[PDB]
Structure formats: structure tokens, C-alpha cells
Write a protein that binds this DNA or RNA. Structure first.
Lengths: 68, 68
DNA sequence: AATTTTCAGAAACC
DNA sequence: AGGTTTCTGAAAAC
DNA sequence: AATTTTCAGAAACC
DNA sequence: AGGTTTCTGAAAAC
């Protein structure tokens, strides 16, 4: 069997980190090979584009206001 | 040769989208296989954890204030 | 609106 | 002139 | 602080 | 009791 997974956003940062770990690595590898190891800018843009792909322009704008 | 790349954050959303495209796919695949296709929550958490991994807790808190 | 791929052309490099 | 890759936008499709 | 991997135990499933 | 995977935190290292 195995313990059922909780939602990612309900987990401790610790447990969150443990689940994304394998993707965190893929992102790292990509950031290095293609974007000069700029994980922040990559994940930021992934998220922003992910928001705008959903027409959550208001939040996307607000995060953009936060980041400069 | 080839045209030199601009910084990801200076590009049009169009051009940004074109560069991350290959990683966008990897994220999609991961989100589907491991997080019930919840790209938003994945990228959000990747970014949040990426910020806190850099002790940018203030911004991380502010994005967390935005998202609920 | 968004998405996607295709077609074009200019721009920046060789 | 040619090459290339990147950037932009439009175009034609979902 | 952060990171990492290791060790533990409890928790939730079979 | 056993199994498993997940979650949490501590522990020992950078």
C-alpha cells in the first residue's frame, strides 16, 4: 500500500522539498545548460507564464510588481 | 555563429515561452505523473522553495500573501 | 483570452 | 552574398 | 541561514 | 505482528 499523499501546498516546506526534489534536479540541469544556472529567473518565469496561461493576469502583475 | 541570447527576464512573453518550452514540457510530465497535473502548485512551490533556499523570505512571504 | 505549429522577416551573430 | 540562431509577430489552426 | 544525506519514528495505508 | 510509502524532525555533515 503506502501512506496517501497530501496536497503539495499543505505540506511542510521540508516535505514539499522532498516531493519536488527530482524535478528540482531537472530544473537545475536545465537552468545550467540553457540559462546560465539562473534557477530563480527560470522558476519565476515558469510560474508567471503558468499564471498568464491561465489568465491570472492580476496575480501575475502583482508578482511582477514584487520582483523587479 | 548565431544571435546571442538576451536575458530571459528581458524577453517578450512570447520569446520567454519559446526558451522554456522544453522545460515547460518536463514540468508538465512531472506534474502529471506525480502531482495530478497541478503545474501551478508545482511551479509556485518550486519558486517559493527557490526563494527560501536563497533566504528571500520577505518576497516568499509576499507571494504567499498573494496566492491563498 | 489561452494554447499550439507554421511562416517571415529582421536582428545579431559567423 | 551565404550561413546560423534568436527574437517578434502574424497567421491558422485547438 | 541555507544546503545535503542519514537515521527514526510516527502516521496512514495494505 | 509484518509490509509499504509519506511525512516530520533531528542529526551530522557542506
Amino acid at each position: 500500500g503506502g501512506r496517501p499523499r497530501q496536497h503539495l501546498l499543505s505540506l511542510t516546506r521540508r516535505a514539499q522539498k522532498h516531493r519536488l526534489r527530482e524535478l528540482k534536479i531537472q530544473v537545475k540541469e536545465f537552468a545550467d545548460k540553457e540559462e546560465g544556472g539562473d534557477v530563480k529567473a527560470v522558476c519565476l518565469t515558469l510560474f508567471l507564464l503558468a499564471l498568464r496561461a491561465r489568465n491570472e493576469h492580476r496575480q501575475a502583475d502583482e508578482l511582477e510588481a514584487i520582483m523587479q
